[PDB]
Amino acid sequence: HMEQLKCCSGILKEMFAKKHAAYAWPFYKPVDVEALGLHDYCDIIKHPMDMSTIKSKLEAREYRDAQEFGADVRLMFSNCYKYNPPDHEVVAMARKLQDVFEMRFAKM
Ligand SMILES: CCS(=O)(=O)Nc1ccc(Oc2ccc(F)cc2F)c(-c2cn(C)c3c(=O)[nH]ccc23)c1
């Protein structure tokens, strides 16, 4: 669990890395529903999640294990797939970032 949670910090650090920035940047912070004018976002997405919130939960030792960390990462992606139409550019970006996560998560 302790070394597992250190590995999860490594995965999140890679997701924040410069080489993935072109598709990862919309996931860096909570979706700003007000600034973006997404008036129905909170109605559709009951549990918003983003990379800064996951980073804070890891630092606060809120995750019991890798499975709990992985569930929040998958929630962030699931929210994006649920809210948006399948052809939305942000959905294409979420899948590219999910490619990064799934590889690392499966090999830990
Ligand atoms: C850093 C968080 S922020 O809120 O500070 N910045 C920000 C700015 C633009 C955004 O939108 C797009 C981003 C890239 C595109 F290629 C198309 C977009 F429309 C979003 C955004 C993020 N997510 C998960 C969604 C989503 O799920 N649907 C709609 C919008 C968004 C967030």
Curated annotation (Swiss-Prot):
Tissues in which the UniProt entry reports expression: Ubiquitously expressed.
Localization, UniProt: Nucleus; Chromosome
Limits of the Bromo domain: 3-108
PTM (free text): Phosphorylation by CK2 disrupt the intramolecular binding between the bromo domain 2 and the NPS region and promotes binding between the NPS and the BID regions, leading to activate the protein and promote binding to acetylated histones. In absence of phosphorylation, BRD4 does not localize to p53/TP53 target gene promoters, phosphorylation promoting recruitment to p53/TP53 target promoters.
Source organism, top-level taxon: Eukaryota
Effect of residue 41 to C: Found in a patient with a neurodevelopmental syndrome; uncertain significance
Site (Acetylated histone binding): 84
Recorded coiled-coil stretches: none
Family statement drawn from the similarity comment of this UniProt entry: Belongs to the BET family.
Miscellaneous: JQ1, a thieno-triazolo-1,4-diazepine derivative, and I-BET, a benzodiazepine derivative, have been tested on tumors with success. Treatment with GSK1210151A (I-BET151, a I-BET derivative) has strong effets on mixed lineage leukemia and promotes myeloid differentiation and leukemia stem-cell depletion.
Oligomer and partners: Interacts with p53/TP53; the interaction is direct. Interacts (via CTD region) with CDK9 and CCNT1, acting as an associated component of P-TEFb complex. Interacts with RELA (when acetylated at 'Lys-310'). Interacts (via NET domain) with NSD3, CHD4, BICRA and ATAD5. The interaction with BICRA bridges BRD4 to the GBAF complex. Interacts (via NET domain) with JMJD6 (via JmjC and N-terminal domains); the interaction is stronger in presence of ssRNA and recruits JMJD6 on distal enhancers. Interacts with NSD3. Interacts with NIPBL. (Microbial infection) Interacts with bovine papillomavirus type 1 regulatory protein E2. This interactions may serve for the tethering of viral genomes to host mitotic chromosomes allowing successful partitioning of the viral genome during cell division.
Task of the protein: Chromatin reader protein that recognizes and binds acetylated histones and plays a key role in transmission of epigenetic memory across cell divisions and transcription regulation. Remains associated with acetylated chromatin throughout the entire cell cycle and provides epigenetic memory for postmitotic G1 gene transcription by preserving acetylated chromatin status and maintaining high-order chromatin structure. During interphase, plays a key role in regulating the transcription of signal-inducible genes by associating with the P-TEFb complex and recruiting it to promoters.
Disease: Cornelia de Lange syndrome 6: A form of Cornelia de Lange syndrome, a clinically heterogeneous developmental disorder associated with malformations affecting multiple systems. It is characterized by facial dysmorphisms, abnormal hands and feet, growth delay, cognitive retardation, hirsutism, gastroesophageal dysfunction and cardiac, ophthalmologic and genitourinary anomalies. CDLS6 inheritance is autosomal dominant.
Domain notes: The NET domain mediates interaction with a number of chromatin proteins involved in transcription regulation (NSD3, JMJD6, CHD4, GLTSCR1 and ATAD5). The C-terminal (CTD) region mediates interaction and recruitment of CDK9 and CCNT1 subunits of the P-TEFb complex. It is also required for maintenance of higher-order chromatin structure.
Protein's name according to its UniProt entry: Bromodomain-containing protein 4
Upper lineage: Eukaryota, Metazoa, Chordata, Craniata, Vertebrata
Boundaries of the shown chain within the full protein: 352 to 457 of 1362
